[model samples]
Target: MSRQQQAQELQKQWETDPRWKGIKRAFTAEDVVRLRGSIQQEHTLAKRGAEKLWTLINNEPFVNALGALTGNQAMQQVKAGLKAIYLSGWQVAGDANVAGEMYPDQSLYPANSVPLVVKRINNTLTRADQIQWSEGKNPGDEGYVDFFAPIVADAEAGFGGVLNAFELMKAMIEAGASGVHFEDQLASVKKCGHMGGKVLVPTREAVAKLTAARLAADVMGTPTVLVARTDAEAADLITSDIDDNDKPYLTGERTVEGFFRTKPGLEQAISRGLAYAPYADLIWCETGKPDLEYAKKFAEAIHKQFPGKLLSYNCSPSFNWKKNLDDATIAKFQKELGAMGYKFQFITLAGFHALNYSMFNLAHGYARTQMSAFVELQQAEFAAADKGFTAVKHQREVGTGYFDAVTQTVER
Candidate 1:
């Protein structure tokens, strides 16, 4: 279809899309019209992902995403019914990277690092999809799995300034990021949200970064979600006392180490979130504890001004689930959080521990039972084949047989 036709189609769909049911955007129709250029045709997957997420949050109580640091893990996540995959910076820094050495989650890697990961994952998903099509399966078939789940990458603090942010976000959109979260901490001192001693850039600095990302996506003609995350709730300092709103939160007292003390908490995040709301597609407040009341209050404060503003929760691994919260609370956690409007929720390092614990279990099991231990694991995978675990046939998992047929046809 022509670009004009495409724009019209998208405009029509956005107007009536049940996915955007009861949602209002900060932009005007003219804004969308200008952004919906001919260039977006190539970014269908990215657009689809953004649309899917927007629809999900507007309709469903909450959307569940699990961090998938690898292609196979993402495939498994989709098969397990999680269609939105989170690419966490923590997981990348911990292990998943091309760097010879694993770095800390301190924005240590180059800005393009996570975007490169996004490219590989989309390529992997595409190849696997073609292999399935070669097997003569169609969509919604019993054995068919959709691996085009939109990836929500962690673009922590944009790795630098607004100029840095433009390229970082552009790379993400080009690399097929349907959505991504950018934090508001100072890029130089940025650490994982659960970590202490973190500092915040001025709120306008963060707003500028989000604006840069939004502009880049607009130019690219993709609805790449800009998740503005504030580490302010747990922050101990600020870069400067430039912004007036930040003054109330900054204490005159200094820390023993000589840095100025800041009382940045839920109220602090609310101020930032309100400033960020205009430019951001979603808001996230990263906290260590999984306190539902605290989260509810944060949402309550954010949504008071920007009603129906979607919220994201880390569901972080930093919280010692067994040590802190009881099983009864854990069981009803997400549903309760969803009721409070934190629609986009994820375990930031879910796959990291999942992979570790799997091997940990296997190591202890094999040490005890040896061969049967290994054999039983394979049996369990095979038994799940009925549930669409095509990886059960290890050869078929990597498209060996399907490609062999292609080789026969081409070479013969």
Candidate 2:
């Protein structure tokens, strides 16, 4: 069957799956605490994810508030809350370029994510991750609309080269990545415990993977997209000001320590011919935070340096700067960037906090798929509470205005 057919079949399979039904019967507040061990069930791969969730649960004050809201008992609700919507498969290895301490303790993708299971309980279906995939078909594929694909950080020297890159193509077809990107990190990219390939191997291998991934997309008959991530040339221009004693990249002091020379990064990515192919259509915006100034520069370089190619940004939601941004800033930047010949997609990490980060940047209902992020829910609550509270006098009105302004600034 074609990929389109496979996608249809997959969706159908998901709806009929018994595991999903089983999940509905399981999960509870105590499971939120017990859920920490589920990652360990997979041994090392998912250990960090489990631990991270544990830490978040421990640190998160929402459990109490959410408990009060749900009335299932805050702790109980935490267990039963299940996962609503969050990004899946954004493991360290999946990222071409990532900063922060090496966290091998974490899974490189969510294919390995074991749902928090409690015996014979009702779990929320929406609680599952939105996008997920792995090297092989995922277990939850029967239930979730998972976008599974193997990410090639550096196509040259890696396993993508071992099977003539056919392994990656096969995995993409089997795993179901709605789209994937091939990166040229050959001879560049320093590996931490989890992020990036260690080195780029050879040109033929890179080309082979690109060819295979797109070919699989074609063979599958679904919208399986292939794109290129140019880490090789980008890393060449990464200059650092850190001393041995005060190393910035190591210390997280420098944001873009290994900055890519804009022109070279774009040119090399295009020169690889991956840019020209219809299958390998999208390009990444290189290494940078969610800064609009950096995004502008990246967009400018992609178009001015190499025209006739699409661009995407790996804007993972892990960055904690979401609540700080004013919507007006995103509006301004997106408008200008659209004019500059580029397409932007914000990637997500495990953090639901990141949801708010991407939401203000979206072009209206484009992100309706993610409702549990509390954006719509909180907005409705805010608006609902606004009615019927009439001001008795001028002082009350001013006081209420102050209260309104202060309340608007708070994050749920």
Candidate 3:
């Protein structure tokens, strides 16, 4: 059968699947369009404080908030109030460092592999709006998607990408992601979006990726929302500060077109967003920092150009600038950004790194100080907690429990 034929059959499978009945209204091509409109409408409501803030619960006019988490405990924390769970590549791979700490390394632990992370979260949490995959260390890496997309999709949960490259996006949909967001960074030297000294592909190249993602989703018979993310503004700002000889490639000013080099950082991003508006469901202006003023201007410019499309803002770990903001100010900050026309507000790595540090400090402190650095004692204590918090619990309690329940019911 042709790819077209396969997609057609897949659409029918999705629509008829009992597990998908509740999500069927929001996961198709036409439905995603409506979802975008609903998100924009919710932004309007939230701006005026006329309704509860647009918080995305597993999936909505919604300032869908996603908390970055890796395990069951972290997933459950945001499941109640927010829309979805963000599975970070760093967290999934057990890289207990900050976003930019290991920018180019793709090495990962087997225990925290993508398949393991997805299954753990998918099994543990029942209330997530959707599960978003941050495509591990390399956003442009297709190998990961090709292998894992099907696993995630078959689990009966909606998946989306924080990935780059058309091939990766196509693989994600075929594997069963409901949506994807691709950045404007050059694939060859890409790093975490929050990291500095980044380079971007030209606007046209970025737009092509967005267009391809949309077309691929349509052909796959799933209405995947294609999100276009621009790192131009952030790169531009960093470019101006660094010496030309230091790392011109990272700046992208010399390598890219005059359109971007001539324009200010934020303006270049707005221009790129305008170009991407036709092909993308949402335009993400990923400012490297919590610069509300810059975000407001970018939103106004892009909103003026594409009033029908939705906009996303990343309150990324780079918001170290405003980490000092009190709780009240932070709440007001959300309101202010909502009023600026951002429909999706994400604190993508807020709790992820914090938990990593907490676990490391607590675990190591007890192990080295209390247990006198005895590796065997730590292992013994861990296992004694429940007869295999070691490996048996995973297969017996966490991993195989559900299957055992169904398969063994007929035996007894």
lDDT of candidate 1 over 253-347, digit per residue (tens): 65444445688688888888888876777889998888998998989998888888888898878778988888999999999999888888999
Score candidate 1 by TM-score against the native: 0.87
Location of the lowest summed lDDT over 10 successive residues in candidate 1: 19-28
Structural similarity to truth (TM-score) of each candidate: 0.87, 0.39, 0.58
Clashes by residue pair, model 1: 19-55
Give lDDT: candidate 3, residue 53. 20
Across 1-412, the per-residue lDDT of candidate 3 in tens digits comes to 5445554665676577542332212235444333223222212111211112212311344454444435544343442334434445444434432332333223323322333444454444421211122212354654212111111111101122223343454455433344456666543343334433555555545555665555555444454555677766755433232332223324244433222232337656766777677666667876756767787788878767666356777776655545677777776776677766666666666556667666686678676587554554566657665631333244532435545555677787
Better of 1 and 3 by lDDT: 1
Over the full model, what C-alpha lDDT does candidate 3 score relative to the true structure? 0.47
Worst 10 residues of 3 by lDDT: 149-158
Which residues of candidate 1, in runs, are more than 4 Å off?
1-41, 190-196, 254-259, 364-372
Q: Predictions ranked by TM-score, top down? A: 1, 3, 2
Q: In terms of TM-score, how similar is model 2 to the real structure? A: 0.39
